Design an enzyme around this catalytic site. Structure first.
Site, short mmCIF file in Angstrom:
data_model
loop_
_atom_site.label_atom_id
_atom_site.label_comp_id
_atom_site.label_asym_id
_atom_site.label_seq_id
_atom_site.Cartn_x
_atom_site.Cartn_y
_atom_site.Cartn_z
N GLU A 1 -44.64 30.17 30.44
CA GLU A 1 -44.09 28.91 29.99
C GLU A 1 -44.05 27.87 31.09
OE1 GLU A 1 -39.83 29.04 29.59
OE2 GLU A 1 -39.86 27.98 27.67
N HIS B 1 -42.91 25.19 33.64
CA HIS B 1 -41.68 25.08 34.40
C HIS B 1 -41.73 23.85 35.30
CE1 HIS B 1 -40.59 29.12 33.12
NE2 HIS B 1 -39.41 28.92 33.68
N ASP C 1 -40.66 33.25 34.31
CA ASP C 1 -39.85 34.11 33.45
C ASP C 1 -40.20 35.58 33.49
OD1 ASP C 1 -38.41 31.94 32.84
OD2 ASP C 1 -38.96 31.83 30.72
N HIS D 1 -36.36 35.14 29.63
CA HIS D 1 -36.68 33.97 28.80
C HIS D 1 -35.66 33.93 27.65
CE1 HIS D 1 -39.16 30.96 26.82
NE2 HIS D 1 -39.46 31.75 25.80
N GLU E 1 -35.14 32.39 24.85
CA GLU E 1 -35.64 32.48 23.48
C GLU E 1 -36.01 33.87 22.98
OE1 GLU E 1 -36.23 30.28 25.83
OE2 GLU E 1 -36.93 28.35 25.06
N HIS F 1 -33.38 25.07 32.79
CA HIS F 1 -34.79 25.43 32.67
C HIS F 1 -35.53 24.63 33.74
CE1 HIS F 1 -38.76 26.36 31.24
NE2 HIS F 1 -39.04 25.07 31.12
N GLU G 1 -33.36 28.69 38.73
CA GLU G 1 -34.66 29.35 38.80
C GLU G 1 -35.46 28.96 40.03
OE1 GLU G 1 -36.21 30.34 34.54
OE2 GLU G 1 -36.10 28.16 34.75
MN LIG Z 1 -38.14 30.36 29.54
ZN LIG Z 2 -37.65 30.01 33.05
#
Ligand SMILES: [Mn+2]
Ligand SMILES: [Zn+2]
Ligand SMILES: [Mn+2]
Ligand SMILES: [Mn+2]
Ligand SMILES: [Mn+2]
Ligand SMILES: [Mn+2]
Ligand SMILES: [Mn+2]
Ligand SMILES: [Zn+2]
Ligand SMILES: [Zn+2]
Ligand SMILES: [Zn+2]
Ligand SMILES: [Zn+2]
Ligand SMILES: [Zn+2]
Lengths: 253, 254, 257, 257, 257, 257
Positions: free
Chosen positions: C32, C34, C43, C118, C120, C176, C181
């Site tokens: 994904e 970033h 992730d 992640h 989701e 996010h 992160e």
């Molecule tokens: Mn993610």
């Molecule tokens: Zn992430």
């Protein structure tokens, strides 16, 4: 009536023919809610909010989904309780997907999915995504969906202080839902049966198979002892007003 | 209450703890029913019948399934009409399957599925079979299911005559039978003045897909409900309730 | 040798499971976007790095990670309209988790920790667990235990949040591609981060509802939900130690020797 | 050469569809118990034989028949507890019908007649059709037309019913393994019928509801729902000719030259 | 009586299974183009004929064959772009096999031989068997045994290969519509083969990889992967006897009385 | 500078794809036992390494590899009864490939090379591709091209086969855990190989058919189908270079600017 089920197909067709008609779909669950409340609460509340929002803004309300995703320990007590009758994720997703496909067939292009059972969220989201993917394959890209959980509209700290004078991830069968029920369906609430226990606390992780010992015996995550009709009326007003405003914003006439 | 949804989980648990509790599940649909009736008829009727039967035999009624399988031309007018909102076969089957799996988990072992939408029949059947198969894998072989359509308990000629004095002719969708029941139970959801008095629909001995709209009467009804009445509805209701109640007593003895 | 199952011979793995109390860990991530300053496999990298350290510390083993996860959501990942993000349908992810558990049970394993990286993925991992456990029951197996967690849920100590966000903390629902992160990445894979490319925009804010199809205008252009301008290796080293320590203690509690 | 697609080379088939008005026919049956007097592939054999004859008269082609159908139901086929009966799950049958329609559309065909010989197959055939037509629409194809029927429905003439049931007609509801099917078999496959094994018994009677798991005690012992004692080759020839011309004319009207 | 289950009454079938050691056989084929010289149902016809002969010798029963198989692949069947070829999705074929095994188990049968006549079906047959055996296990049944085979694998004797390919043998990889299948058809179904229509082209050669969507230019125009010009009834009879005896003995070995 | 999609920012990936003619490569492997001398992620490691080198030479990008593949079959991978081996159901693998292709198409990519390192995955990858291409067509996309291959198929030159098997070549059919894979691992990941643990048994031989449930007695005890005693870093380096330039040239030919 604002309920699609109570209209003739001609009345419904006439409404959709306006080209800007908004449809609303309540998504709930049949789940245990302590010793003091009935099990259809997650269907009753979003349906009641939908009814009022629809009357306020001129929308229509589809028959609600009576069964939702499996109850999770930290949000609904756990799927080991009797009474709670849950669907597999794929089943709920497919139901939302099929309904959107059919509404698109009717010519409708605006849908509000109002969730009343926390655990349903992501399966409703997948249903929406899969349906929109198909619509695109059918040459339809003007169908718009707004999805929400009615309880997410009560964030104002000011309102919160009122509901909790003594001062969200523990509101299953507690003050919030019980208060709303006292304002809407008092005959389905028996406050004298409330088990006044301390708020449930959990570590930052989940365990499966669900361990019954980690959920309060009554099935509630917190006590509804301080619930009241007054609090429910406040909650109801905040939710209906907030949701109605959001819809007017996203689906203008 | 006879409705499971209105019971607390303790009230429900107490009833199932009996050992021979009977649960009933209404299965309907959201489907057009002509210019004179609302679209939730297939849900309202079986639910009303379940409620009354439940009151007489001491059973409980589960929340009804609001959406059913695709409307077929010869039975419900066709799935091309607006309003009619149908599920794919796999979705309905899966819903029935999941519910039976859960009821078995609760310890229940007796279920009556009352279908109010003709087209649901075979998908309800597959849902039952798949659920029973799983229950067997779980070591459960004592779960019994009865499936019926309330409109199948009206056979007595004396009753049929009263209902259709002009003669009994599959064309009932939105006709005398359902309309009469609605007039007796939910009169505010029916307006007989909007009824289109066309002759009963007739079709060739086969089906065509994509569905051809021209083969379904414009109103969506397959027969006229002009002769529908509250009185006829009262008769139908009592006949179905008594027949279904006795059938349940025979299949699910105390 | 390694704590990675993929790096063991089947005989070594068999010997470990033969102990009867072996703990297995499975990182679940995603591919994904970033933002402009970090790579897209974050992730997967982060939960794998955490799993590696926890496993080494407590004597567990780590299964190959799931590289693809559920569709990115606007409010948590920016949205699935972004290029690069490559997502699976829910049923696909659920089925993968379900299949893995069924196989581990076949090996004789009975303890699994699913570490999600992640947000989701959560509910689909849950459904995969439920469906697998249902099958195990049908097979006569009821002693398989699973612990599911997101490594980011173990940073709660206010003293830690203070050091990480001295200017104030504004919830984790906006982390996010932000400070959290990025700091971990600076401490673990600094070569895959370029802070000079960070777009220092204000934290994204959303109404209490979602709109579909996803509206690109509602996600900050860079793809990040908050600015990682104040991210640092020091913060990452703090986050890492608190997470490893916390998760290790949790596993010791749930899966005693 | 042959009206059966399976007996044609791909070149011959291609030439036939290239005409632009080719009608394809698909027999859908089942492997199901049919009493002590008849074999178990009756539901496949009959529609295939009827399709063959209709095809010879209208210039159509017949696809290989579906040998396995949906689960036998007590009130229509005796029940799925009988040995021999080998049934598919609903999704499997639906998927098979759907896949074949998709492939025929790929070939360029646009006219299909599905002849069902197993009552229980009905709704699953209908769903397979709907799912396929939905898919075809997504592919930009909306001129594929399908006709679904059963030879049973083409026997309605009073003069014919009287000849078949000189002692009264009760309906197609109890015909499983009875006069209608057995007579057709006697005319088409006399060697697969031993009428001397027919177990005479009154027509099956059931309450206005169904019970599951299926109760063996509620189906006549032989598996038939009515007696084929009065079945005959002559009745079979009558039924066959009546169904063939009736179906042939229906196809001509729905799929005009 | 007949060796075909479809030609038996349920009473006859039940008796045979009641024996306790009954072996069932399931031919699995396809409706696929087989060049300009042969019909499209070859893949179902051949295994059905071989099953029949094996069954008559060992006392087994043959189930109705699966008429539709998995999508034709370029390097094994020419490709699924050809007209006539009508293929199922993998899930559909898998489910069909799974359903049939589940039902045979319900009957009380515990021995099954699946004879595949269409190469592309192999892995879906395998998955169907695994899913079915998994379910049987959940039902408490672990004594159901399955044998999967193809007549192609029983022709390995150098002496036989020389007689069939006196000019040289290149393997089974290019046999689609070639000498092997055509010779068997000439010996079993001469009316369905027109050898005079064969296109005598050299063996198909392909690069070390596959391309999708399938590129029609990479398959010999006729659809065949090798020339059947040297096919004959004599070679067919040889292949048949070798395969029947080899398979019959394999079955005796795996399913001892 | 990296060829791995996971190590790029979404902006860098977007530029590469929007540049056009971008070739994406997806390694598909498995977690499977590979004897007493090698680790279990071999089928993932090798195609990933080959892809990296090919990508560096032709300017392609490499997607995160699929770590779990289809069930190991006795004749190709020893069987799915071994501990360690962790396999997915066919539908799960196909769905994963399908979802990935759908997403890459959404990104705007139209060129994909799937490099398979686990034999048993092939048909499920194929089905995933077909289902994905079917969907792309419904979305109005018909210019997406996929190449599927295995590095095994690029080692054909007799001169190379000579240096690899100076004592005689028998085929890839028995290569699981043998000389080929072990030699590649010795050249790329020596620390994950301990040649001293190799069991020098004769090449596995099986009857001309398969049995289910799998019979453990039919697979060599170590899990290997042939001995890797003669494996070496030198052979690995030879194989690697041959496969890399072979695959690189094939891709250049199938995907010209
Ligand atoms: Mn993610
Ligand atoms: Zn992430
Ligand atoms: Mn809830
Ligand atoms: Mn209806
Ligand atoms: Mn039948
Ligand atoms: Mn073939
Ligand atoms: Mn392998
Ligand atoms: Zn609730
Ligand atoms: Zn109705
Ligand atoms: Zn029949
Ligand atoms: Zn062939
Ligand atoms: Zn390998």
């Amino acid at each position: 009536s604002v309920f699609v089920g109570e209209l003739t197909w001609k009345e419904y067709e006439a409404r959709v023919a306006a080209g800007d008609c908004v449809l609303m779909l309540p998504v709930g669950a049949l789940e245990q809610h302590g010793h003091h409340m009935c099990m259809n609460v997650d269907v009753l509340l979003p349906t009641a909010v939908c009814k009022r929002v629809a009357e306020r803004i001129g929308a229509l309300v589809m028959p609600g989904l009576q069964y939702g995703y499996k109850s999770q320990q930290k949000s609904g007590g756990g799927n080991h309780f009797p009474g709670t009758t849950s669907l597999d994720g794929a089943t709920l997703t497919g139901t939302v997907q099929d309904i959107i496909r059919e509404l698109a067939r009717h010519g409708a292009r605006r849908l509000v999915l109002m969730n009343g059972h926390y655990e349903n969220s992501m399966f409703i989201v997948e249903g929406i995504d899969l349906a929109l993917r198909e619509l695109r394959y059918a040459g339809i890209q003007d169908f718009k969906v707004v999805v929400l959980s009615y309880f997410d509209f009560v964030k104002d700290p000011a309102v919160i202080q009122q509901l909790y004078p003594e001062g969200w991830d523990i509101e299953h069968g507690g003050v919030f839902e019980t208060s709303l029920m006292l304002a809407l369906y008092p005959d389905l609430v028996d406050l004298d049966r409330v088990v006044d226990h301390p708020p449930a606390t959990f570590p930052p992780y989940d365990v499966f198979p669900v361990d019954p010992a980690r959920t309060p015996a009554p099935g509630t995550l917190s006590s509804a002892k301080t619930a009241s009709r007054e609090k429910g009326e406040l909650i109801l007003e905040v939710c209906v007003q907030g949701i109605a405003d959001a819809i007017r914003e996203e689906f203008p006439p």
